[PDB]
Amino acid sequence: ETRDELTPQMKEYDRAGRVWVPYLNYFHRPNHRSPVVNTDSRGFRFVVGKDGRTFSEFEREPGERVRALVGGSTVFGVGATGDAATLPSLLSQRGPARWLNFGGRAFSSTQELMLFLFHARSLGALEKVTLLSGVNNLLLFYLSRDYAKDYGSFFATEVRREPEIVLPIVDHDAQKTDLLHAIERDLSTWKLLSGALQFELCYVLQPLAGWVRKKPSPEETRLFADRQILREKMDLAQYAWFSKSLADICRTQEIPFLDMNATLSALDLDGRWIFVDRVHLTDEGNEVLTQALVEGGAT
Amino acid sequence: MASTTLETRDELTPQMKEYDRAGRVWVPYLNYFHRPNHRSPVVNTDSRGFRFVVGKDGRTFSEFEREPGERVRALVGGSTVFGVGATGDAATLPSLLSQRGPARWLNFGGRAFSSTQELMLFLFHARSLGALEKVTLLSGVNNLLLFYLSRDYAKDYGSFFEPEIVLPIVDHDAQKTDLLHAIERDLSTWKLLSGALQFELCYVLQPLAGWVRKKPSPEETRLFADRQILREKMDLAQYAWFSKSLADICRTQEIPFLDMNATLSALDLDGRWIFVDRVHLTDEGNEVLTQALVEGGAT
């Protein structure tokens, strides 16, 4: 099969496993061990710095400079061939400061914020939190049958089981705007935490294959050939609206904003193998993304 | 068959019928909140499930509505803040505090909430509230009660009403210090919010009938006659440990703390009808509590 042929590492992200967690609803199974992916006792992915030095369990020594990359599966590094090939590892291997992997597979913006609030007190002082996010809230909105504007939603809302707070959606395209509220509210909270914990904050719209203008590599073409939202609902008009909408939110709140889809389109990636699927990145993808992050002042 | 009479609950506390019917809905992340737009003589909730507050001159406040110049404070907690046991919205603590002035008080009581749910409810709605002068937390007991009802627990997250994050409890009494972590962690987030939103913060251990020294009223004697968790797990030894443990957390974080159980034991309430049940207050109880809160400097 193509996925096993070209991206064999994916069989291991299938086995990594999720567990139910109160409030968060889910996180990664802790203590997972494999050559591709390793998680510590709280479910956080290992980070690899220089010469194979591994960091986990919120370990922090004196004088260490620490930063946090927060997001979904792009931050976790689904599609990487190893812990060392993920963004936090690549960022740690370059810059002065080490980076924490606060990526949560399939997390919405609200789960990203909550994961940080649940553990912030164990991390020490952070210089910079970079948020690499956005796409999941758009995706899971269109995968939802019901939605609460004030709270948002998350993927496995099979968890839920006359007046209600979570209301049925009648027209996803006509009610789009409602999903922005959760992002704007979550960003406002990050802004509050930025000043209180004295870290710089940057919001980065994560890359989506259909939104990056790039002649695909032979590998990509074959991988994508194997659902109507990620298709029809996520067209370039959608990108136009979403990107603009998040840039407006961030500007109003004086949050540096960086749209990685536009950044990757401006680079010359024609024919380069960047994606293992429409959402996830290869090792080379992470290398390029990291380069663009550093370059864009988001690190 | 001999004629049937009203249950002691319906005869002495008929308003409890309305609290049974008021309703509870599922909400993501919070897991549950009050059914919105509920109408009854006893209890009313707005479009978000928050209870109505009655200010001076019988004026009702809801929907986070605010006028220019208003001084606003927030009472955050569980069913004691919500006002289960009251005969009307106007007999609840936020209403009693708003009538006294100088500020109007929001009812951020969530029925059955844990400390974590209380914090999340606030983080989900804070941006809509405007400036707050003081948040008063009236809480604690539920985290203890829910810990002893839980069969499983994740120390980093808590709980509410192949490896795992949520671990089974082997001995509640021996693992009971685990529940302090969630309280201390949430309080540190409150402490952080108090600085960023510039409001005063104060913690009040909510009353529990078994923890208040008071010769029972005749109503209370009938009502209490009818879960050992209340019988043996919440004994005076438990009260001693819990109260002292919360005092230590609050002193470390420089948060003013008030043990309402001790405050009420010191007053002359012998024979007075304070408790609708072991956890819920009468109207009279809310007046006593309000006076104690104001005199204690917790408002």
Numbering used by the authors:
A (entry chain A): 7 to 167, 201 to 265, 275 to 347
B (entry chain B): 1 to 161, 201 to 265, 275 to 347
The paper states:
Here we use in vitro experiments to demonstrate that three proteins, CgnB, CgnC and CgnE, are sufficient for the production of the hallmark tetracyclic crocagin core from the precursor peptide CgnA. We further show that the hydrolase CgnD liberates the crocagin core scaffold, which is subsequently N-methylated by CgnL. The crystal structures of the homologues CgnB and CgnE reveal them to be the founding members of a peptide-binding protein family and allow us to rationalize their distinct functions.
Intriguingly, it appeared as if the dimer provides two antiparallel channels for substrate binding that terminated at the respective active sites. The catalytic triad comprised Asp325, His328 and Ser79, and the distance observed between the Asp325 atom Oδ2 and His328 atom Hδ2 was within the expected range (1.8 Å). Removal of the sulfate in silico and subsequent rotation of the Ser side chain did not allow the distance to decrease below 2.8 Å. The resulting lack of nucleophilicity appeared a probable cause for the slow turnover and was supported by our inability to label CgnD with phenylmethylsulfonyl fluoride. Slow proteolytic processing of modified precursor peptides has been observed in a number of RiPP biosynthetic pathways and may be linked to biosynthetic timing.
